[PDB]
Symmetry: D2
Subunit: 113 residues, 4 copies
């Protein structure tokens, strides 16, 4: 039913870990995905605002920092705004199902629980 995607990229900044009145934790961060080339590299670019919640949000929070190369699988969510202030605005966000630091150019010590 939903539209899902996988985006590989680096966090543009440390994950903002804020809490809701009810206590549940929410982690926000935008992944910036940037491509490859030939003969000379680099181009394209894609910045997707993401949000994970619950314990995954705190793990994201305590396990990721700026520049971190991540793998993110989630659901695209989009909202459509105004006209009574200007004229047609669209925004998009990714509800993260799973995310983890990528092991393509690095390592990590994974501690269970």
């Amino acid at each position: 039913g939903d539209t899902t995607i996988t985006i590989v990229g680096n966090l543009t900044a440390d994950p903002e870990l804020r809490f809701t009145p009810s206590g549940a934790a929410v982690a926000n961060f935008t992944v910036a995905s940037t491509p490859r080339i030939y003969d000379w590299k680099d181009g394209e670019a894609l910045f997707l605002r993401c949000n994970i919640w619950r314990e995954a949000a705190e793990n994201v929070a305590e396990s990721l920092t700026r520049g971190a190369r991540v793998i993110v699988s989630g659901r695209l969510k989009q909202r459509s705004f105004e006209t009574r202030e200007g004229e047609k605005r669209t925004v998009i966000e990714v509800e993260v199902d799973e995310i983890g630091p990528s092991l393509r150019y690095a390592t990590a010590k994974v501690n269970k629980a």
Copy 2:
């Protein structure tokens, strides 16, 4: 132009088996056990439906990075391309994944990530 790609989440059946080709190129093997949930629309709660087993081989330094970072039953995210090998009996084809990116899922766990060094 492009291969068929998939993102599979699951657990490592066993630690990554790191070997090296004759030329020296590293190669890590493992299989992800992706278990989907099923809901008995009548009592009980969610259930562990039929699991999928996908063997995956990652190459070069990524593989070495795997061998040194992931272990048994670790939950991981795998983005890769489906490749159909061919092994003979005694015809036979089998479908495995060639990893492009893989990382530990921060779902039920944390991780200390050490960047390597390039840019």
Copy 3:
């Protein structure tokens, strides 16, 4: 390298088939994907502007109409605008690799070439 997605939904309107000075054809259309429910259906929603080019653009043009339920595989492309007129705008579009009418609630006569 690129970020790809698959969106199943219906065209919100017939595909605009316009041509470029050079002659190549371009088909534009926005797919509107809307979900399922339980116990009572319907919710969510996602509208993604798409564009196919070349012969696929004309085939899309002559094979699809409004309401058509399609399957679309492409690449997300996003651009970031202004600040010298207002303050930060983001837009997204799907460069369609493959698209075809879905056979979930219909049929179609496929004529080769």
Copy 4:
């Protein structure tokens, strides 16, 4: 919670084999031949690399819709979920696709689509 999903583009090895379960539910089988391109970075142009063969089974009216709409070598788009069956020799597992949506690709062809009737 969710299965592993994939979008595979390719051609039908053969016309869809439509059969019916004992209860009456329709079932169509077929396999997509997805051929990826390879570039000899030295002369020649693009090349037809190693193809992937995935068997797919679609259900109910969708299947009937398949049987009545698709034929041999037709290019199609398939969105589905990977399912691992189990058949025994003489153990054995195999990976096939359970289609959720499938349609003829308007890449190298057109199509006349007849909506059915619901909403």
